[PDB]
Amino acid sequence: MIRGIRGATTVERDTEEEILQKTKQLLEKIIEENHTKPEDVVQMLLSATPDLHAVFPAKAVRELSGWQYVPVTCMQEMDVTGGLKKCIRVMMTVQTDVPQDQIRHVYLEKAVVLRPD
Amino acid sequence: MIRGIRGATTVERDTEEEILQKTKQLLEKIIEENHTKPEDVVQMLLSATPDLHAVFPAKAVRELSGWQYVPVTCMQEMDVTGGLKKCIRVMMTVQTDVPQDQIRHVYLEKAVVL
Amino acid sequence: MIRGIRGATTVERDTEEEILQKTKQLLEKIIEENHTKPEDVVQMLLSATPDLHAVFPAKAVRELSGWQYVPVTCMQEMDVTGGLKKCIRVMMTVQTDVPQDQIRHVYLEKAVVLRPDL
Numbered sequence: 032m033i034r035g036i037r038g039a040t041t042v043e044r045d046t047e048e049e050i051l052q053k054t055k056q057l058l059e060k061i062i063e064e065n066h067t068k069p070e071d072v073v074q075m076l077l078s079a080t081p082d083l084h085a086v087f088p089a090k091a092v093r094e095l096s097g098w099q100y101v102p103v104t105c106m107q108e109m110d111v112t113g114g115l116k117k118c119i120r121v122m123m124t125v126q127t128d129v130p131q132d133q134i135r136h137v138y139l140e141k142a143v144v145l146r147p148d
Numbered sequence: 149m150i151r152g153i154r155g156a157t158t159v160e161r162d163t164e165e166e167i168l169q170k171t172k173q174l175l176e177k178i179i180e181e182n183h184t185k186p187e188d189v190v191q192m193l194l195s196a197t198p199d200l201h202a203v204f205p206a207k208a209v210r211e212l213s214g215w216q217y218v219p220v221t222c223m224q225e226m227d228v229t230g231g232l233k234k235c236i237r238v239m240m241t242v243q244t245d246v247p248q249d250q251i252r253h254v255y256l257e258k259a260v261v262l
Numbered sequence: 263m264i265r266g267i268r269g270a271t272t273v274e275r276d277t278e279e280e281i282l283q284k285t286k287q288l289l290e291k292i293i294e295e296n297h298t299k300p301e302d303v304v305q306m307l308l309s310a311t312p313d314l315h316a317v318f319p320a321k322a323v324r325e326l327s328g329w330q331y332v333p334v335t336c337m338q339e340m341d342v343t344g345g346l347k348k349c350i351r352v353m354m355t356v357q358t359d360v361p362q363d364q365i366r367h368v369y370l371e372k373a374v375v376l377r378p379d380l
């Protein structure tokens with residue numbers, strides 16, 4: 032089957048180093064939890080809240096050996112009033128046979144309050 | 149195959165109870181029209197126009213029993229001139245066999261004009 | 263498997279006649295290069311940088327024969343300091359047996375500079 036994996040993380044500053052570090056760390060954690068290999072990945076979508084401008088989060092994928100052919104595009108998360116600020120989210124679509132209810136979705140930094148289930 | 153099921157609806161005011169009620173009603177209808185099982189849904193995207201700020205349309209998914217582990221995420225619709233105001237659109241990806249031309253895509257409220 | 267194909271192009275002006283023309287061109291080249299049939303497409307997402315408001319690029323899909331039931335939707339590409347301007351991007355999800363490293367992603371117009379290793 033092919034399924035989606037969700038991740039979320041936050042930076043303390045809209046700085047290219049912290050966006051890339053914190054996105055790469057999110058990506059690593061998902062891959063680790065989900066045993067994901069680059070050729071299992073259909074595509075990835077990364078969103079930033081409307082207050083991060085330094086760099087596109089997807090540049091962090093280029094710091095993962097083997098991931099040069101995984102499709103990615105970024106997007107503006109909608110501007111909700113009360114939304115967790117300075118947040119990056121990933122929806123990674125993967126060829127997998129693990130059941131829906133057993134996929135591991137990662138939530139790091141201040142994002143751990145988004146989905147505490 | 150896996151295929152996507154498009155939907156769109158419009159709220160009449162930007163407030164949580166309103167956004168979530170109209171998003172949940174769109175989803176119940178998509179699930180109804182295509183007889184969708186949560187375990188059949190790869191992922192779902194929900195976009196709102198930049199004039200809606202009260203709540204993520206996504207939170208409405210959790211009102212559909214059985215849908216907790218379905219991966220949903222929102223994004224913003226681009227502001228297009230002569231665009232439908234206060235509109236919420238979904239792209240749901242389900243594993244299915246029903247031909248492309250027979251997928252039942254759903255447009256509700258003023259979004260019937262899309 | 264189902265794999266993602268990627269495209270990007272740029273318009274010179276924010277006019278409907280241009281967003282729809284550059285988006286038709288970009289979709290043709292991807293369909294061509296990858297032999298994509300409309301019934302192999304799972305869905306498509308198109309993003310545009312926040313400086314394009316003339317039209318939704320998904321309307322160009324309608325200009326392609328047989329592409330009438332392919333799901334499309336758009337989103338705002340995040341605004342990045344030094345991002346390529348007036349740019350449209352396509353993430354076309356398709357069912358293909360072609361392998362990852364042979365999928366042809368097609369970058370056109372000023373977008374040639376975004377991923378030059380493809």
Ligand SMILES: O=C(O)[C@@H]1C[C@]2(C(=O)O)C=C[C@@H](O)[C@@H](C2)O1
Nearest residue numbers: 087089090103104105270376377
């Ligand atoms: O269109 C593109 O190809 C480029 C590359 C990019 C990436 O970092 O991988 C991927 C998606 C877009 O958000 C940006 C960043 O532009």
Ligand SMILES: O=C(O)[C@@H]1C[C@]2(C(=O)O)C=C[C@@H](O)[C@@H](C2)O1
Nearest residue numbers: 039145146204206207220221222
């Ligand atoms: O990243 C997230 O997981 C959270 C939860 C959310 C939901 O309401 O389900 C789903 C998608 C995101 O757009 C928002 C809303 O943040």
Ligand SMILES: O=C(O)[C@@H]1C[C@]2(C(=O)O)C=C[C@@H](O)[C@@H](C2)O1
Nearest residue numbers: 156237262318320321334335336
């Ligand atoms: O919801 C819709 O169906 C309509 C039509 C549209 C298009 O231009 O084809 C397709 C996708 C949406 O993002 C917009 C534009 O609204």
